[PDB]
Amino acid sequence: RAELTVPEMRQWLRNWVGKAVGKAPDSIDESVPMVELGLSSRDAVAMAADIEDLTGVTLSVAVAFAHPTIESLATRIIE
Protein backbone atom coordinates (compact mmCIF):
# COMPACT_ATOMS: atom_id res chain seq x y z
CA ARG A 1 0.00 0.00 0.00
CA ALA A 2 1.32 3.42 -1.00
CA GLU A 3 -0.51 5.63 1.49
CA LEU A 4 0.74 6.37 4.98
CA THR A 5 -0.57 3.65 7.33
CA VAL A 6 -1.59 3.58 10.98
CA PRO A 7 1.38 1.35 11.94
CA GLU A 8 3.71 3.85 10.24
CA MET A 9 2.05 6.79 12.01
CA ARG A 10 2.30 5.03 15.37
CA GLN A 11 5.99 4.32 14.81
CA TRP A 12 6.61 7.92 13.77
CA LEU A 13 4.99 9.17 16.98
CA ARG A 14 6.93 6.73 19.18
CA ASN A 15 10.16 7.88 17.52
CA TRP A 16 9.24 11.55 17.92
CA VAL A 17 8.32 11.18 21.60
CA GLY A 18 11.30 8.94 22.35
CA LYS A 19 13.69 11.55 20.98
CA ALA A 20 11.99 14.40 22.84
CA VAL A 21 12.08 12.66 26.24
CA GLY A 22 15.29 10.67 25.84
CA LYS A 23 13.85 7.14 25.83
CA ALA A 24 13.91 4.22 23.42
CA PRO A 25 10.93 4.49 21.02
CA ASP A 26 10.07 0.82 21.62
CA SER A 27 9.43 1.66 25.29
CA ILE A 28 6.92 4.47 24.60
CA ASP A 29 3.48 3.35 25.79
CA GLU A 30 0.87 4.05 23.12
CA SER A 31 -2.18 3.80 25.43
CA VAL A 32 -1.25 6.41 28.06
CA PRO A 33 -2.33 10.06 27.76
CA MET A 34 0.20 11.97 25.70
CA VAL A 35 0.18 14.73 28.35
CA GLU A 36 1.78 12.15 30.69
CA LEU A 37 4.66 11.19 28.37
CA GLY A 38 6.99 13.98 29.52
CA LEU A 39 6.46 16.30 26.54
CA SER A 40 6.59 20.07 26.99
CA SER A 41 4.28 22.63 25.43
CA ARG A 42 7.18 23.58 23.16
CA ASP A 43 7.33 19.92 22.13
CA ALA A 44 3.62 19.99 21.30
CA VAL A 45 4.16 22.95 18.95
CA ALA A 46 7.11 21.27 17.26
CA MET A 47 5.37 17.91 16.94
CA ALA A 48 2.28 19.54 15.49
CA ALA A 49 4.46 21.29 12.91
CA ASP A 50 6.23 18.03 12.06
CA ILE A 51 2.92 16.17 11.71
CA GLU A 52 1.72 18.87 9.33
CA ASP A 53 4.91 18.45 7.26
CA LEU A 54 4.49 14.66 7.22
CA THR A 55 0.76 14.42 6.53
CA GLY A 56 -0.47 17.82 5.36
CA VAL A 57 -2.89 17.80 8.33
CA THR A 58 -3.10 20.74 10.74
CA LEU A 59 -4.25 19.04 13.94
CA SER A 60 -6.93 20.88 15.90
CA VAL A 61 -6.93 21.07 19.69
CA ALA A 62 -10.29 19.33 19.59
CA VAL A 63 -9.12 16.34 17.56
CA ALA A 64 -5.89 15.94 19.49
CA PHE A 65 -7.35 15.99 22.97
CA ALA A 66 -10.30 13.83 21.91
CA HIS A 67 -7.72 11.25 20.74
CA PRO A 68 -5.21 11.76 23.54
CA THR A 69 -3.09 8.61 23.18
CA ILE A 70 -0.50 7.75 20.55
CA GLU A 71 -2.55 4.87 19.19
CA SER A 72 -5.83 6.81 19.02
CA LEU A 73 -4.19 9.93 17.57
CA ALA A 74 -2.40 7.89 14.92
CA THR A 75 -5.61 6.11 13.95
CA ARG A 76 -7.50 9.40 13.64
CA ILE A 77 -4.77 11.17 11.61
CA ILE A 78 -4.82 8.40 9.01
CA GLU A 79 -8.47 7.40 9.27
Measured from the CB atom, is 1 or 42 closer to Ca ion?
Answer: 42
Nearest C-alpha neighbor of 16 from the set 28, 5, 4: 28
Cα separation, 65 vs 1, whole angstroms: 29
Cα separation, 56 vs 40, whole angstroms: 23
Asked if 39 interacts with Ca ion (CB under 5 A), we say no
Measured from the CB atom, is 20 or 78 closer to Ca ion?
Answer: 20
* Contact of 75 with 6, CB cutoff 8 Å: yes
Q: How far is the CB of 61 from Ca ion (least distance, A)?
A: 18
Q: How far is the CB of 27 from Ca ion (least distance, A)?
A: 11
Q: Applying CB under 5 A, which residues contact Ca ion?
A: 20, 29, 31, 53
